[PDB]
C-alpha cells in the first residue's frame, strides 16, 4: 500500500495536468483506502473563497481543510462552521497571523496582485506551515496564464532555541493557454516541485518568519527561472525536434 | 497477458510531496471534490 | 463505494490518457491499483486498442522496411490491421504492441490508383519534413463516397531524460470532381516529468479544398495543402511560445520587486 501510493503518485505524474482535479477524484474512487494520503500529497490548482466576516479572500487546500470545511486565516473560523476542527495552538495562531501579514506584503512586492494565505500546524517538536499564492495574469488576451505557489515548510527548533532546521518543499504550478477552443487551442500547463533544507540562527533579529521568508523568496526566484527554461526552452526544443 | 510491462526509464520517479509534514484532521472528508 | 464496473471504467480511462511513450508505465500503475487481472482484461481491452489507434502507433513488421500506423482506418476486425502500402494484413497484440502473422490482402479498387499516388507523394513529404516520421494512406468508400485518408506520425521518446513528444495529423480527401473538400486535424503532445509534470496539448482543425484532376496531379496538390497547413501550424505554435515567454509569463511574477532589491524581511515584520 506504500507501493500503491507510489503507483498513484506515478500516475499523477503522467496524466494530463489539465485534468488534475478530475483525475484525483477518479483515482480516489479507484483506491478509496488511499484517500487521506492522496489528499495530502497531491497538489491541486488553488481555489479562492471569501471570508464574509472579515471581507478578504483566502486560498483552499488540504492543509486548511477539515471534514468538508475550510479554515480562513483572517477570522480563524471554519466554513461551513465546524464543531471540532483542527486548530493551531494559541501561540501558533499568533505566529500564523504575523506570517499571513508578512506574506501578504511579499505577494504584493513580487506579484502586484493575486491572493495569498498561510496555514500553520503544531508538530511534536516544532511546527509546519503552508504558504499559498495564486496570481492570474490578464485573462482577456489571446493567451492567458496563472501561477500557483504551494510552499510547505517543516521547522524543527533546537533545544537551545538558537538555531532551527528548516525543510522546504515547493510546488509551483504554471498554466498558460489560448482563449480559443478547440481548433487552434494550445495549452501548456503543469507544475514543478523542488526541495531546500537549511539550518538557521533563530533570534530577535532573525525570527522564524524572516528565516522562512528568505527560503521561500530564494526558492521562488530560482523556480521562476527554472520554469522559464523548462516551459519556454525545453518543451519548445522538444516540439522543434518532432 | 495480463502481466507487468517493461520500462526504459531506468529508475523510479521520486515523489517529493510524500515527505511533507502531515497535519492531522479531526474528521475525514465526505467527498474528495 | 464505487462498483468493480466503475473501477475498471476508471482504469480504462487512465490508460487512454497515457502520454505518448508511457503506455507501459500507466498500465503497470493501473494494473496494480485495480488489483484484479481478470477485471482489467475484460473491462479495459477496449482501451488498449483505442489508445493505439488514437496515438497512431507505428509498428515494424518483419520483412517489410516501412513501418505502418495503427489507426481506426486499418482496423479489419478480430485483431487484424491493414497495411495498405504492403498489401498485407497482420495480427496486432495491443499490449505488447507487436505485429505477427502477415498475410496477403486483396485491395484493387482502383481507388487504389489514387491511394498509391497519394502514398508516394506523402512518403517523400514525410521523409523531408520529419526526422523520424511514418505515414499510412488509406483508400475506401464511406457512405458511398471515395475518400483518401492520410495519417502521419512522428515522435521522440527520451524516457531516460524524463520526456516524450508526439505529432499526429490525419488528412481526409473526399473525391468529388472538380473540387475535393479537405478536412484535417493536427495534434501535438509533449510531456516533461523530471521533478514535475508539464504538458503541451494542442490541436488544429483544417478545412480547405483541392481541385481534382489526375491521381498523380491531385496527390501533388493534396501534399501541397498538407505542407502549407502543417508549416503554418508549426509557425503558430512557435509564435505562441514567443508570446508566452516574453509577455504572458512576465505578467505573473516579477523577477525582483519594483525597488529591485530583495526583500528586507525585518522591515516587512515591523
Curated annotation (Swiss-Prot), chain A:
Gene Ontology MF, one: actin filament binding
Role this protein plays: F-actin-capping proteins bind in a Ca(2+)-independent manner to the fast growing ends of actin filaments (barbed end) thereby blocking the exchange of subunits at these ends. Unlike other capping proteins (such as gelsolin and severin), these proteins do not sever actin filaments. May play a role in the regulation of cell morphology and cytoskeletal organization.
Domain of life: Eukaryota
Record carries keyword Cytoplasm: yes
SUPFAM superfamilies: Subunits of heterodimeric actin filament capping protein Capz
Coiled-coil residue windows: none
Subunit comment: Component of the F-actin capping complex, composed of a heterodimer of an alpha and a beta subunit. Component of the WASH complex.
InterPro entries for this protein: CapZ_alpha/beta, CapZ_alpha/beta_2, CAPZB, CAPZB_N, F-actin_capping_bsu_CS
Modified residues (N-acetylserine): 1
Classification of source organism: Eukaryota, Metazoa, Chordata, Craniata, Vertebrata
Transmembrane portions of the chain: none
Gene Ontology cellular component terms for the protein in this record: brush border; cortical cytoskeleton; cytosol; F-actin capping protein complex; hippocampal mossy fiber to CA3 synapse; lamellipodium; membrane; postsynaptic density
Gene3D superfamilies for this protein: 1.20.58.570, Capz alpha-1 subunit (6.10.250.30), F-actin capping protein, beta subunit (3.90.1150.210)
Biological process terms in GO annotation: actin polymerization or depolymerization; barbed-end actin filament capping; cell morphogenesis; cytoskeleton organization; lamellipodium assembly; negative regulation of filopodium assembly; regulation of cell morphogenesis; regulation of lamellipodium assembly
Keyword list, A-Z: Acetylation, Actin capping, Actin-binding, Cytoplasm, Cytoskeleton
Protein name stated in the entry: F-actin-capping protein subunit beta isoforms 1 and 2
PANTHER family: F-ACTIN-CAPPING PROTEIN SUBUNIT BETA, F-ACTIN-CAPPING PROTEIN SUBUNIT BETA ISOFORMS 1 AND 2
Similarity comment: Belongs to the F-actin-capping protein beta subunit family.
From Swiss-Prot, chain B:
Subcellular location: Cytoplasm; Cytoplasm, Cytoskeleton; Cell membrane; Cell projection, Lamellipodium
Tissues expressed in: Expressed in lung, placenta, small intestine, liver, thymus, colon, skeletal muscle, heart and brain. Higher expression in kidney.
Basic and acidic residues bias spans: 8-17
Chain segments carrying region Disordered: 1-31
Subunit description: Homodimer. Interacts (via C-terminus) with heterodimer capping protein (CP); this interaction uncaps barbed ends capped by CP, enhances barbed-end actin polymerization and promotes lamellipodial formation and cell migration. Interacts with heterodimer capping protein (CP). Interacts with MYO1E. Interacts with TRIO.
Record family assignment: Belongs to the CARMIL family.
Function: Cell membrane-cytoskeleton-associated protein that plays a role in the regulation of actin polymerization at the barbed end of actin filaments. Prevents F-actin heterodimeric capping protein (CP) activity at the leading edges of migrating cells, and hence generates uncapped barbed ends and enhances actin polymerization, however, seems unable to nucleate filaments. Plays a role in lamellipodial protrusion formations and cell migration.
Domain notes: The C-terminus is necessary for localization to the cell membrane.
Name of the molecule in the record: F-actin-uncapping protein LRRC16A
Lineage: Eukaryota, Metazoa, Chordata, Craniata, Vertebrata
UniProtKB/Swiss-Prot annotation, chain C:
Keyword Lyase applies: no
Compartments it resides in: Cytoplasm, Myofibril, Sarcomere, Z line; Cytoplasm, Cytoskeleton
GO CC, any one term: cortical cytoskeleton
GO process terms (BP): actin cytoskeleton organization; barbed-end actin filament capping; cell junction assembly
One Pfam match: F-actin_cap_A
Protein name per its UniProtKB record: F-actin-capping protein subunit alpha-1
Family that this chain belongs to: Belongs to the F-actin-capping protein alpha subunit family.
Binding partners and assembly: Component of the F-actin capping complex, composed of a heterodimer of an alpha and a beta subunit. Subunit of dynactin, a multiprotein complex part of a tripartite complex with dynein and a adapter, such as BICDL1, BICD2 or HOOK3. The dynactin complex is built around ACTR1A/ACTB filament and consists of an actin-related filament composed of a shoulder domain, a pointed end and a barbed end. Its length is defined by its flexible shoulder domain. The soulder is composed of 2 DCTN1 subunits, 4 DCTN2 and 2 DCTN3.
Function in brief: F-actin-capping proteins bind in a Ca(2+)-independent manner to the fast growing ends of actin filaments (barbed end) thereby blocking the exchange of subunits at these ends. Unlike other capping proteins (such as gelsolin and severin), these proteins do not sever actin filaments. May play a role in the formation of epithelial cell junctions. Forms, with CAPZB, the barbed end of the fast growing ends of actin filaments in the dynactin complex and stabilizes dynactin structure.
Organ and tissue specificity: Present in all tissues examined.
SS bond list: none
GO molecular function: actin filament binding
Keywords: Actin capping, Actin-binding, Cytoplasm, Cytoskeleton
Tree of life domain: Eukaryota
Amino acid at each position: 500500500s506504500d507501493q500503491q501510493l507510489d503507483c498513484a503518485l506515478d500516475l499523477m505524474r503522467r496524466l494530463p495536468p489539465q485534468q488534475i482535479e478530475k483525475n484525483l477524484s477518479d483515482l480516489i474512487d479507484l483506491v478509496p483506502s488511499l484517500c487521506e494520503d492522496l489528499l495530502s500529497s497531491v497538489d491541486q490548482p488553488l481555489k479562492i473563497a471569501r471570508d464574509k466576516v472579515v471581507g478578504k479572500d483566502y486560498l483552499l487546500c488540504d492543509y486548511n481543510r477539515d471534514g468538508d470545511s475550510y479554515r480562513s486565516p483572517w477570522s480563524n473560523k471554519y466554513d461551513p462552521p465546524l464543531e471540532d476542527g483542527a486548530m493551531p495552538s494559541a501561540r501558533l495562531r499568533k505566529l500564523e497571523v504575523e506570517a499571513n501579514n508578512a506574506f501578504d506584503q511579499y505577494r504584493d512586492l513580487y506579484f502586484e496582485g493575486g491572493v495569498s494565505s498561510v496555514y500553520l500546524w503544531d508538530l511534536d517538536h516544532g511546527f509546519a506551515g503552508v504558504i499559498l499564492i495564486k496570481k492570474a495574469g490578464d485573462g482577456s488576451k489571446k493567451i492567458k496564464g496563472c501561477w500557483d505557489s504551494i510552499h510547505v515548510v517543516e521547522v524543527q527548533e533546537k533545544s537551545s532555541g538558537r538555531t532551527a532546521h528548516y525543510k522546504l518543499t515547493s510546488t509551483v504550478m504554471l498554466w498558460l493557454q489560448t482563449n480559443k477552443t478547440g481548433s487552434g487551442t494550445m495549452n501548456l500547463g503543469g507544475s514543478l516541485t523542488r526541495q531546500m533544507e537549511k539550518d538557521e540562527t533563530v533570534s530577535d533579529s532573525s525570527p522564524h518568519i524572516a528565516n522562512i521568508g528568505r527560503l521561500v523568496e530564494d526558492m521562488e526566484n530560482k523556480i521562476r527561472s527554472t520554469l522559464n527554461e523548462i516551459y519556454f526552452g525545453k518543451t519548445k526544443d522538444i516540439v522543434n525536434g518532432l | 497477458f495480463i502481466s507487468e510491462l517493461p520500462s526504459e526509464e531506468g529508475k523510479k520517479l521520486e515523489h517529493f510531496t510524500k515527505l511533507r509534514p502531515k497535519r492531522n484532521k479531526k474528521q475525514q472528508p465526505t467527498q474528495a471534490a | 463505494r464505487v462498483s468493480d464496473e466503475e473501477k475498471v471504467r476508471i482504469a480504462a480511462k487512465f490508460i487512454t490518457h497515457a502520454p505518448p511513450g508511457e503506455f507501459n508505465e500507466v498500465f503497470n500503475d493501473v494494473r496494480l491499483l485495480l488489483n484484479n487481472d481478470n477485471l482489467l482484461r475484460e473491462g479495459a481491452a477496449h482501451a488498449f486498442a483505442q489508445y493505439n489507434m488514437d496515438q497512431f502507433t507505428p509498428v515494424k513488421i518483419e520483412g517489410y522496411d516501412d513501418q505502418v500506423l495503427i489507426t481506426e482506418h486499418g482496423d479489419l476486425g478480430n485483431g487484424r490491421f491493414l497495411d495498405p502500402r504492403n498489401k498485407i494484413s497482420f495480427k496486432f497484440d495491443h499490449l505488447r504492441k507487436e505485429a505477427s502473422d502477415p498475410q496477403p490482402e486483396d485491395t484493387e479498387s482502383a481507388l487504389k490508383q489514387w491511394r498509391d499516388a497519394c502514398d508516394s507523394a506523402l512518403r517523400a513529404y514525410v521523409k523531408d519534413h520529419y526526422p523520424n516520421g511514418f505515414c499510412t494512406v488509406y483508400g475506401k468508400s464511406i457512405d458511398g463516397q471515395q475518400t483518401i485518408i492520410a495519417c502521419i506520425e512522428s515522435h521522440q521518446f527520451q524516457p531516460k531524460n524524463f520526456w516524450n513528444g508526439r505529432w499526429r495529423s490525419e488528412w481526409k480527401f473526399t473525391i468529388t470532381p472538380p473540387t475535393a473538400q479537405v478536412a484535417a486535424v493536427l495534434k501535438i503532445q509533449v510531456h516533461y516529468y523530471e521533478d514535475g509534470n508539464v504538458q503541451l496539448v494542442s490541436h488544429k482543425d483544417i478545412q480547405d479544398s483541392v481541385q481534382v484532376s489526375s491521381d498523380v496531379q491531385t496527390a501533388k496538390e493534396f501534399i501541397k495543402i498538407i505542407e502549407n497547413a502543417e508549416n503554418e501550424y508549426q509557425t503558430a505554435i512557435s509564435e505562441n511560445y514567443q508570446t508566452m515567454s516574453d509577455t504572458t509569463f512576465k505578467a505573473l511574477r516579477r523577477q525582483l520587486p519594483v525597488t529591485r532589491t530583495k526583500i528586507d524581511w525585518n522591515k516587512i515584520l515591523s
